[PDB]
Design a protein around this ligand. Structure first.
Ligand code: A1ACA
Ligand code: A1ACA
Ligand code: CL
Ligand code: CL
Lengths: 4, 124, 124, 4
């Protein structure tokens, strides 16, 4: 999971 | 927004759609290319091809279970492109590049047409 | 093999499937969550959820145009997860995390359950 | 396009  | 994103989600979705294709699950159309038949999901075809997008948004053709392609279309070129739609991998070879490019132009698959043109320009 | 790969293909496919969802094109099922209704593509639901995969591979349920979820399921949690399926983006907030995690457990969306558990563990 |  990432900060888009 | 303040959303988080799962990097591998799109790839995982496409991998599962390809698994459904391989087991012939919920396929809703047959694409006829000369003597060959290819089963697929209308939504995947529309998401990958400007031609299928135009076909399945037509109020009459959206309901067809069989679509016949132009007789000039090569079944092997179509097969290679159908595989690309469901996997992101393109089996581009010296022996098939002309048929693949002609099929991608007909199907309106701009990124495939672009790489074919570049690979052809390199060999001249 | 000797294939080439188009990095953005899977993301572009999912973006187009979401565009078809937004315009209600070729959606083939309604998911009922209490008083709310959500239109979707069976194939996308199966590709994202172990529960929908089990439902639409069943010889009788594969033909249903309406699926009713358990009354304990929160429509907002379902909406957030449906958005995630079509976009890879999860709108996870302090006010919705419990409903989202409960809905992802029911839908069998392992990666979502995992990030919810981690975000909850960080706040304790 | 890349070599996968
Ligand atoms: O080279 C390409 C690939 C492609 C795909 C689609 N498909 C869709 N396009 C839009 Cl805007 N909305 C929903 C869908 Br499905 C249209 C055109 C093209 N040209
Ligand atoms: O957390 C998750 C997400 C998910 C998706 C599917 N979907 C499919 N799985 C397989 Cl193996 N083939 C085709 C399809 Br469609 C099955 C289980 C799960 N569990
Ligand atoms: Cl393309
Ligand atoms: Cl997930």
């Amino acid at each position: 999971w990432v900060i888009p | 927004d303040s959303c988080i994103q799962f990097t591998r989600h799109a790839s995982d979705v496409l991998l599962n759609l390809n698994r459904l294709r391989s087991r012939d699950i919920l396929t809703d159309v047959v694409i006829v290319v000369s003597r060959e038949q290819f089963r697929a999901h209308k939504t995947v075809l529309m998401a990958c091809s400007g031609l299928f997008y135009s076909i399945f948004t037509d109020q009459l053709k959206c309901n067809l279970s069989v679509i016949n392609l132009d007789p000039e279309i090569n079944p092997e070129g179509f097969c290679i492109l159908l595989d690309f739609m469901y996997t992101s991998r393109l089996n581009l070879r010296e022996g098939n590049i002309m048929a693949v490019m002609a099929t991608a132009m007909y199907l309106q698959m701009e990124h495939v047409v672009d790489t074919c043109r570049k690979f052809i320009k390199a060999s001249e």
